[PDB]
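User: Can you fold this complex?
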Amino acid sequence: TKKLSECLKRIGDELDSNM
Amino acid sequence: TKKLSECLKRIGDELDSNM
Amino acid sequence: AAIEFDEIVKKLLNIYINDICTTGEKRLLNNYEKSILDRIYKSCEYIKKNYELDFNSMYNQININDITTSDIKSKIIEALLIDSRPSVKLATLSFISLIAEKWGEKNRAKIMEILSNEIVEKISNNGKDFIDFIDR
Amino acid sequence: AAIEFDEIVKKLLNIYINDICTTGEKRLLNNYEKSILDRIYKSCEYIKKNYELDFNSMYNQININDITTSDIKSKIIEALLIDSRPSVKLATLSFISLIAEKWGEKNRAKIMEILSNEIVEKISNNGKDFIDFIDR
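Assistant: Here's the predicted assembly.
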């Protein structure tokens, strides 16, 4: 049901993915 | 005994004194 | 563990968000509201600049003494009680601006609890004459 | 009497002083603290710029619904509960920045009560790794 927790994790994952 | 009330009035008086 | 930077981050976040909130509040204002607010800045900074020595002595009675709040409120409001002149209101506001300017490492709430409630209401009372005193 | 400008003045004073307080808090910081804080601005604005559409949908669940606070806190903190990564912390902070950016006519306290207490503590926990993620 649209978990903001899952979205924030997914955003955080794409963040540290770039180096 | 140094009333801040009296000082603020005196400051306010010198303020509107200038026009 | 690496905990020597925890208090530093904690302090910066309570500054960043407060500055973002202010930006958000300033964002939902029209050109007129922005014009009036700008006049307040220049007006209060002018007083604190030309009446710095006066404010300093008043500040030394309010600050360095370890007395609880609201004592400060009743200390300052007396000028607004007798004289409801816009000049007195502006002078009072400039003084609070000085206090907030010197209490940087103190809690933000310690300054806002002085400004809000009954105090900000009195300065706002008949504020049309207050604006015309500043915007002209 | 002339009372149609009372609420306007009242709103501007709760903006002016808050902006002065922020200036005072920023004034008592060294060059290092200022450097870190500056990195936070550019970092969060970068995320809100490239993840605006993601934040918008998350915002639409949090905002338009008439639900009491702390529900929002438990709604957001869950990401910080499982993952204590600096990337997640930064993503979480950027989202709060968006909320504070859109709630300009709402009370400042409604945003700060979400940030302060337990929430700001978790983001600060092991903040040395948080800074190194931003300042490098």
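Chain D is about 75% helix and 0% strand. The radius of gyration of chain D is 17 Å.
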